Amino acid sequence: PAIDRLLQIATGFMASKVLLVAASLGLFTELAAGPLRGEELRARLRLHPRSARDFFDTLVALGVLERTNGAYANTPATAQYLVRGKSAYLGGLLEMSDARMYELWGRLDEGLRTGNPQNEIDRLDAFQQAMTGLSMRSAHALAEAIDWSAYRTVADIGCAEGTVLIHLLERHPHLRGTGFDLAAVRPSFQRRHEESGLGDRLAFRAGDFFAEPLPQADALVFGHILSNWALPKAKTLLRKAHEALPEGGIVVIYETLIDDERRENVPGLLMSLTMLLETPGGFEYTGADCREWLADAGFRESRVQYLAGPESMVIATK
Amino acid sequence: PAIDRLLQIATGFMASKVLLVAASLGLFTELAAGPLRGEELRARLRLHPRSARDFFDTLVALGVLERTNGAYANTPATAQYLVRGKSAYLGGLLEMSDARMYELWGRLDEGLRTGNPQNGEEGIYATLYDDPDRLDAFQQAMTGLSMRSAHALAEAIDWSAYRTVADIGCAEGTVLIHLLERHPHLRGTGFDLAAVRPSFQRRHEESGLGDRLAFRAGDFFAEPLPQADALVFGHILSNWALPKAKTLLRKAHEALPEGGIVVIYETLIDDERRENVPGLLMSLTMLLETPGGFEYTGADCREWLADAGFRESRVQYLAGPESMVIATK
Ligand SMILES: C[S@@+](CC[C@H](N)C(=O)[O-])C[C@H]1O[C@@H](n2cnc3c(N)ncnc32)[C@H](O)[C@@H]1O
Numbered sequence: 001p002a003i004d005r006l007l008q009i010a011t012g013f014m015a016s017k018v019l020l021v022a023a024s025l026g027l028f029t030e031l032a033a034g035p036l037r038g039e040e041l042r043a044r045l046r047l048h049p050r051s052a053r054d055f056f057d058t059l060v061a062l063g064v065l066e067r068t069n070g071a072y073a074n075t076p077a078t079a080q081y082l083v084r085g086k087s088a089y090l091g092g093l094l095e096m097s098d099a100r101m102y103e104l105w106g107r108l109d110e111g112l113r114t115g116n117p118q119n120e121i122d123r124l125d126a127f128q129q130a131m132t133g134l135s136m137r138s139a140h141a142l143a144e145a146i147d148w149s150a151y152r153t154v155a156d157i158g159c160a161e162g163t164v165l166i167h168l169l170e171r172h173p174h175l176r177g178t179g180f181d182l183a184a185v186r187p188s189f190q191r192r193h194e195e196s197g198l199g200d201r202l203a204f205r206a207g208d209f210f211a212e213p214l215p216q217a218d219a220l221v222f223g224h225i226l227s228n229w230a231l232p233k234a235k236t237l238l239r240k241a242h243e244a245l246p247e248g249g250i251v252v253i254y255e256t257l258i259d260d261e262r263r264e265n266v267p268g269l270l271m272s273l274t275m276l277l278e279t280p281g282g283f284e285y286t287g288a289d290c291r292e293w294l295a296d297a298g299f300r301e302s303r304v305q306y307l308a309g310p311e312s313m314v315i316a317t318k
Numbered sequence: 319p320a321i322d323r324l325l326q327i328a329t330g331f332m333a334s335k336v337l338l339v340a341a342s343l344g345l346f347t348e349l350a351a352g353p354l355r356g357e358e359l360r361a362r363l364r365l366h367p368r369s370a371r372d373f374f375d376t377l378v379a380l381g382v383l384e385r386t387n388g389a390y391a392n393t394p395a396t397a398q399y400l401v402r403g404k405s406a407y408l409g410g411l412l413e414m415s416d417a418r419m420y421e422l423w424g425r426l427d428e429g430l431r432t433g434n435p436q437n438g439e440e441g442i443y444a445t446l447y448d449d450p451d452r453l454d455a456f457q458q459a460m461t462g463l464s465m466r467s468a469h470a471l472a473e474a475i476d477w478s479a480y481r482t483v484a485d486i487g488c489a490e491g492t493v494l495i496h497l498l499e500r501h502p503h504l505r506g507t508g509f510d511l512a513a514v515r516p517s518f519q520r521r522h523e524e525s526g527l528g529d530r531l532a533f534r535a536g537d538f539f540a541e542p543l544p545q546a547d548a549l550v551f552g553h554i555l556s557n558w559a560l561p562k563a564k565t566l567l568r569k570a571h572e573a574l575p576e577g578g579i580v581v582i583y584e585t586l587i588d589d590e591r592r593e594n595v596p597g598l599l600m601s602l603t604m605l606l607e608t609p610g611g612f613e614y615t616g617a618d619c620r621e622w623l624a625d626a627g628f629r630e631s632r633v634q635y636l637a638g639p640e641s642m643v644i645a646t647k
């Protein structure tokens with residue numbers, strides 16, 4: 001029935017919490033060495049004997065854990081994506097949802113009634129690990145979705161620790177890259193930079209993009225940037241991208257974009273409510289919204305293109 | 319789409335909260351008289367313009383609202399089951415999840431680490447000042463959602479060999495009343511704490527069962543159980559620690575005549591403890607809500623029944639996530 005599906009959505013916070021706590025405990029990382037029986041897994045996770053077995057079996061029943069002859073083990077998906085240290089690890093997103101977003105979303109009604117965020121308005125490394133997991137599939141797709149051989153240089157605006165840019169340059173040996181972010185991010189960028197071995201091919205530029213021009217490059221990337229800010233400041237960033245680009249250069253913007261008709265992309269619409277809860281004036285937008293802003297900024301051509309999972313990009317040519 | 323399935327589960331708290339808040343706002347009730355535009359619905363709910371349309375459009379994208387030419391409307395399910403005032407209203411489940419259970423599950427980690435329930439700081443009588451209309455709506459929904467299993471309990475057993483039935487911890491008596499309506503030969507007794515009698519009496523009066531049904535005030539951990547040919551335990555044993563569950567089975571055996579039956583129903587976990595998500599989640603609910611409760615399997619229960627001296631037990635599916643275990647003295 002339609003009502004059974006409706007109630008399953010309504011009570012989805014229970015199974016969500018089961019998986020979020022398992023991620024917070026690093027349960028899947030503890031199983032990366034091999035299968036463990038319930039008593040051993042409980043001891044490693046420091047869980048109480050009352051409900052540990054129920055907890056593990058719930059994960060099995062949800063399809064996010066294997067159990068064979070009394071030993072729990074990762075599924076192919078949890079092995080690939082929820083084991084810490086692996087390149088495709090996105091568990092940082094679940095750890096952040098468990099530590100912060102679950103309780104923040106508990107304040108949705110107040111956000112809806114006031115229109116004001118419901119948050120405070122390590123730590124940095126927690127935010128960066130959540131962002132890496134959010135942008136993980138999109139960063140790989142970004143390296144394949146555009147013919148990068150046509151550009152010499154790329155500047156990632158709001159680059160954080162530089163994961164997207166580093167993968168782009170590793171994937172395309174000809175590229176030179178510049179990451180742009182606040183000065184407090186430089187150490188995290190410098191660490192990833194040194195670990196990549198990319199050397200002189202990659203550089204960091206410290207600054208505030210609401211007070212300083214952007215680095216000049218053949219391509220400029222905006223990953224999960226514009227959705228954080230009220231529309232006039234996003235329009236300011238699009239103008240600065242135009243000024244930083246040469247003729248034929250491109251601006252690339254990717255988000256969990258809402259469908260143009262605003263009736264299908266659930267992660268995008270949910271993201272817009274996260275922006276409500278987290279920011280004074282951010283919101284999630286549609287590809288059509290962005291193409292209007294880009295034409296207004298002076299770009300001559302633009303298209304919307306699917307990326308990965310719920311995320312999409314808008315590309316414009318100066 | 320394997321990782322996409324996992325991410326849908328892990329972030330299900332968001333879609334949940336959207337629906338839970340829509341229920342606490344009575345959004346679907348506001349749409350009962352007919353479709354409303356965004357600004358009209360916004361104003362009727364006293365929501366800020368910044369995110370009202372995003373909220374409304376999320377519900378459309380989840381498939382719980384319709385939108386035609388900019389007019390938001392109930393889907394057939396929300397119009398039937400999420401409009402306050404209707405006898406079929408189930409929104410009390412969402413209201414109570416929003417008001418209470420969502421935050422409770424926020425403490426799952428502490429419950430798993432401590433083994434202790436997670437459910438003083440406020441003033442005197444704080445607990446007594448909860449929204450009684452929301453509490454009533456929640457109970458109305460649990461009464462309704464249980465009707466399938468009450469229908470099944472009446473049909474799964476040949477009740478003709480038994481004269482009398484007692485429901486132990488009967489609460490408002492819904493199952494016992496339905497069984498008596500379906501099998502008019504049965505005389506019935508509901509057994510529960512004295513404070514439960516008003517809610518039972520209301521259902522008793524509404525049923526017309528009259529002289530064929532009685533309520534008996536009692537504490538089943540402190541007094542003998544009513545003697546009847548059949549004893550029913552609906553969602554009782556799972557609320558209590560194992561020594562107490564065994565104690566109740568012993569008292570059932572003592573209360574029953576030779577040939578009498580004990581009838582237990584629960585959201586049982588599958589015997590292999592790997593399939594039944596409602597049952598496993600219920601066991602974690604018991605962690606968070608009770609000091610000693612636990613969900614169990616049919617096989618677990620048949621062992622306790624054999625140890626209590628019962629004969630000829632079996633496990634039988636009832637309806638949806640509910641199953642019964644029945645045994646003969
Ligand atoms: C949501 S994170 C996005 C990280 C990355 N682009 C991605 O998609 O995963 C936003 C980034 O913008 C940066 N940022 C915020 N305000 C900034 C400012 N005023 N100037 C430069 N960078 C800023 C933050 O440091 C943060 O790393």
Ligand SMILES: C[S@@+](CC[C@H](N)C(=O)[O-])C[C@H]1O[C@@H](n2cnc3c(N)ncnc32)[C@H](O)[C@@H]1O
Nearest residue numbers: 487488489510511514536537538539552553554
């Ligand atoms: C799960 S609720 C009842 C559910 C009911 N059997 C049904 O399925 O609709 C547990 C019931 O046991 C009753 N109860 C709890 N402790 C009791 C006690 N010590 N003696 C008698 N009844 C008790 C409560 O009042 C409550 O009605």
